[PDB]
Design a protein around this nucleic acid. Structure first.
Lengths: 61, 251, 164, 54, 49
RNA sequence: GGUUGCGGCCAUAUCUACCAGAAAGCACCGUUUCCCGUCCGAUCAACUGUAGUUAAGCUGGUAAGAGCCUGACCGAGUAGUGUAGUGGGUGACCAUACGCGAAACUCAGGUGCUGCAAUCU
RNA sequence: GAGAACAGAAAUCUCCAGUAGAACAAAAGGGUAAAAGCCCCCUUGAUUUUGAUUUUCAGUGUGAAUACAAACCAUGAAAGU
RNA sequence: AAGCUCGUAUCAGUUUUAUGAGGUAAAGCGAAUGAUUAGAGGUUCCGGGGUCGAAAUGACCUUGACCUAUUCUCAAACUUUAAAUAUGUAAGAAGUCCUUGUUACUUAAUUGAACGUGGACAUUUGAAUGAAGAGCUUUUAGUGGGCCAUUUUUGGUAAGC
């Protein structure tokens, strides 16, 4: 009475995993084919030469 | 009509709003992983369209097509909308779709699609059915709506049904206008008088025509006129353009 | 885009069923040349002596050139004068005549006297676009007739003025 | 009269296990026209793997 | 919260485990917030534990 | 690129108003012997593409139109809510900590896309 | 809404607008516009054999229902039902 | 309780990613529906009913058949849109691909379907975290009068209701 996406989407991830093991078999390199959750993000130098930061001064009322 | 009225109601389907397709009938035909083939026969003014159409969610696929305007290649040049040329087109697709499958392996079977034409006995629609069933397709049918079926008894006349295949109701009607009221006979049938085709020879023309159809159904295309791109240029002369906002803002 | 008469509808409304329904049914048959059709009542009002589905009244429809004789012979009873309104916004007109012997008949003491309603519908060519089954459509405003266009047409032929 | 108190804590003592989804599910309830063909389909391919490949 | 406190092996009171920070484990700490006290440890405390 | 046959998604495709459409194609229109169906050849049937037409149909363009559909540091991190305290208040209910997060509205932009077969200055 | 002898608040006929404001044996809520409404045409599948499944449930009964298989049929040009 | 077949089995009162389902809170009423309290007159525009009657030109009665030209205000049994919390499913070895065997089903067609032979794919083999082993069977005791709290609530003015 219905049809469901998630399994057909799971099938496409198996197809992409098929190609990655084929390429790494050609040129010797790790596959790293497992998925990972989101990581804590890295360090970055941020310089605001365009825009000096401004005070907010929580006045309103 | 009020504003809340037009906000409320949903439209029908586009192919339902335009009155062409009956969606109650289509659901029975399409839904019968094997492609399911269907004989679509339509009758407009001056034309016969007979197509074998499968089904796909992309929307449709046509296997073969026969048209009325290909009949002058086969020797029928006059009276293209009548019952007998509809029989000749029904023969025509049956030889055509069979050669490309190489069957000319139980039978090949097709289902008849009418459209919206009302089923009356003696209709021109089922002449396309009778042609395909004589041609070699498995088109399932019964002898109800063929011409020559008595409403009183459960019998058929094969002599009258042979006659309508070979232009019987036309060439007999040439005989009633020849002896009576030439002024009617001068107006109609004027292509017959210029080609000097008398009435008895009309049965000879259809008989040679079915021999011509079974000879070469391989459908050479018409050559064409100028190109696609030459034809695309003249069509751009008539069609207008859209208007931009800044052209419409100052307006 | 000419202004041809589509059909002529001849109607008679009788309160009772019996001989009087069947006698007037013979009148419209011999006049129009066609066997008429009868209509049954929808519901009961009891002020009129009727019940549901009683075949209360007859009518008959005529098309073509045979209808134009019946109009031209009928409208002479009205002496080439309509009244002022008589016209739809759509474009059509009707007029009711008493005393069917005015258009002449053998006297028929068995059949007797009946009052026939007339009604005319007007359309231009191209009206098959509505009435057909495949690819049904609506007629545009420039081809929809008018109340105006019936006034111009009827004043021209049959030589009448409308009135008032 | 009726209350569903303590009824969740009773069922979650032995847990809620799955019906463990065997290989080769039972063909009772599968369409009998398919079952009648699939009887003969396994019969030929056991004969064909007996004499030919050995 | 009681299932999550077992999955991080925090059985009894005043027990402690290291937890790798991902998007997945951060939501596990988000459920058990009224019961745990956590922070980012230095090289000194891990050596002493 | 324009039409035709069969469609998919089913208003960005509807609705109302005017305006245009060379070509081919659809359409209106011509007739009533046969098949057939009516009160009525108007629908439906057959016959002719011959006598006539773009007036409609349909196709396209426009309207500070109605509607619809996408966008928004728009409404608004507001409403509402999960969890927490020996927090406040006589209560009604309200603050704070860790979380999730709307809607109408407002404004901007849009007005069918497309699959197969065929035919066309 | 606009028109038609008697004819009017309501008879019959005509046309335009008309997303369901009607009708579907009955309570209420769902469902339905070339139909599941309305009017006609032919009919008995409201049949035979007994299994499988869903609802209340101990996954026992009873009632009600769903999808097939083997027979014979009804309708339709046909797919089907 | 007695144990049995085995010993990383694949499971979990949990999250994440990828998709499903829902129609309460809030929003909406110049986007349909929508009560309520009270009702003034309409003798063939009804007749639902009651007693009567040697009949049907038949009386006597009652709820009234009818709202006839009224307004404004909402809702647990009104809706276009629609959070939170809870909820279904998937994250692979029984899986993926290549080659062609079986059949009395299916197709115009060895085309499909279903199950396979032979070959390839290896420990990051297909998210996180945990696992005082996992799987399974027999057999039997007691119990089948429950109460309290926070939050969401129905009846009751309000109850240690």
């Amino acid at each position: 009475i219905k049809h469901s996406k998630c399994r057909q989407e799971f099938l496409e991830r198996v197809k992409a995993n098929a190609a990655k093991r084929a390429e790494a078999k050609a040129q010797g390199v790790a596959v790293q084919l497992k998925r990972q959750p989101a990581q804590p993000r890295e360090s970055r130098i941020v310089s605001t030469e365009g825009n000096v930061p401004q005070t907010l001064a929580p006045v309103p009322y | 009509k009020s504003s809340a009225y037009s906000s409320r109601f949903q439209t029908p389907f586009r192919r339902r709003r335009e009155g062409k397709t009956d969606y109650y009938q289509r659901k029975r035909l399409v839904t019968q992983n094997t492609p399911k083939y269907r004989l679509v026969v339509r009758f407009t003014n001056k034309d016969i369209i007979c197509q074998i159409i499968s089904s796909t969610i992309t929307g449709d696929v046509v296997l073969a097509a026969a048209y009325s305007h290909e009949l002058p290649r086969y020797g029928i040049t006059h009276g293209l909308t009548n019952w007998a040329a509809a029989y000749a087109t029904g023969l025509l697709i049956a030889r055509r779709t069979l050669q490309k499958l190489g069957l000319d392996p139980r039978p090949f079977k097709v289902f008849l699609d009418i459209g919206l034409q009302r089923t009356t006995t003696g209709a021109r629609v089922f002449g396309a059915l009778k042609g395909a069933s004589d041609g070699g397709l498995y088109v399932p049918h019964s002898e109800n709506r063929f011409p020559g079926w008595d409403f009183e008894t459960e019998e058929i006349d094969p002599e009258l049904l042979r006659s309508y295949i070979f232009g019987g109701h036309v060439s007999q009607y040439m005989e009633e206008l020849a002896d009576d009221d030439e002024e009617r006979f001068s107006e109609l049938f004027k292509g017959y008088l210029a080609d000097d085709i008398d009435a008895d020879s009309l049965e000879d023309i259809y008989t040679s025509a079915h021999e011509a159809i079974r000879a070469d159904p391989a459908f050479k295309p018409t050559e064409k006129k100028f190109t696609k791109e030459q034809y695309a240029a003249e069509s751009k002369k008539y069609r207008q353009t859209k208007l931009s906002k800044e052209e419409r803002a100052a307006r | 885009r000419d202004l041809k008469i589509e059909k002529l509808v001849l109607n008679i409304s009788v309160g009772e069923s019996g001989d009087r329904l069947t006698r007037a049914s013979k009148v419209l048959e011999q006049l129009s040349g066609q066997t008429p059709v009868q209509s049954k009542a929808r519901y009961t009002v009891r002020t009129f002596g009727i019940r549901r589905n009683e075949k209360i009244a007859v009518h008959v429809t005529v098309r073509g050139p045979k209808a134009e004789e019946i109009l031209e012979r009928g409208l002479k009873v009205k002496e080439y004068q309509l009244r002022d309104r008589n016209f739809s916004a759509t474009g059509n007109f009707g007029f009711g005549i008493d005393e069917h012997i005015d258009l002449g008949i053998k006297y028929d003491p068995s059949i007797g006297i009946f009052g026939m309603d007339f009604y005319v519908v007007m359309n231009r060519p191209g009206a098959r676009v509505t009435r057909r089954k495949r690819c049904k459509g609506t007629v545009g405003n420039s081809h929809k007739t008018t109340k105006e266009d019936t006034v111009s047409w009827f004043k021209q032929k049959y030589d009448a003025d409308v009135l008032d | 009269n009726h209350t569903a108190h303590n009824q969740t804590r009773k069922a979650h003592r032995n847990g809620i296990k799955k019906p463990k989804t065997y290989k080769y599910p039972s063909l009772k309830g599968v369409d009998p026209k398919f079952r009648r063909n699939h009887k003969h389909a396994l019969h030929g391919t056991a004969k064909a793997l007996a004499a030919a490949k050995k | 919260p009681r299932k999550v406190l077992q999955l991080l092996r925090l059985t009894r009171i005043n027990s402690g485990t290291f937890v790798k920070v991902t998007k997945a484990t951060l939501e596990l700490l988000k459920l058990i917030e009224p019961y745990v006290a956590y922070g980012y440890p230095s090289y000194s405390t891990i050596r002493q534990l």
